Amino acid sequence: APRIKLKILNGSYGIARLSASEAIPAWADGGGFVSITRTDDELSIVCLIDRIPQDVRVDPGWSCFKFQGPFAFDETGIVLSVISPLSTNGIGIFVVSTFDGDHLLVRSNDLEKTADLLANAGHSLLLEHHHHHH
């Protein structure tokens, strides 16, 4: 199984749901991880909870991880290797693939269990981030 390096991101994330035809809100793009996806039925926005307004439907309380470094692989399931230990053990997953690689979000209350499960599965976790306020 591939051993993946996962880097935690600072901040609390949320998944907002907007109207399928609504314009991208001004609060969507900003600092941190941002994923704006429009489909034939919804306009979904993942971003720091701080920017999500109170008049928008949202699934809050998420933590984000970035799949790290170069990906020289040989037909191996990088995403599979990471989500298998989580999904098989009751941990909900939210995956956002990108040109460079992938990001994974799990509910913040599942952070400790997620870290234990991923380490046991052989993955490396960089859990450093500047959380404390100013």
C-alpha to C-alpha distance for 33 and 10, rounded to whole angstroms? 10
- Report the SS3 class of residue 44: strand
Choices 3.30.2130.10, 3.40.50.1370, 3.40.50.300, 3.50.50.60: CATH for 1-134? 3.30.2130.10
Query: Which residue from 30, 28, 6, 3 is spatially nearest to 16, judged by alpha carbons?
Result: 28
User: What is the bridge-based pairing of β-strands 57-67 and 94-97?
Assistant: unpaired
Q: What is the resolution of this structure in A?
A: 1.5
Domain regions of the chain by residue span: 1-134
Query: 24: which 2 tokens?
Result: 């991208």
Strand partners, 15: 46, 59
Query: Which residue from 78, 61, 69, 71 is spatially nearest to 16, judged by alpha carbons?
Result: 61
Question: How was it solved?
Answer: X-ray
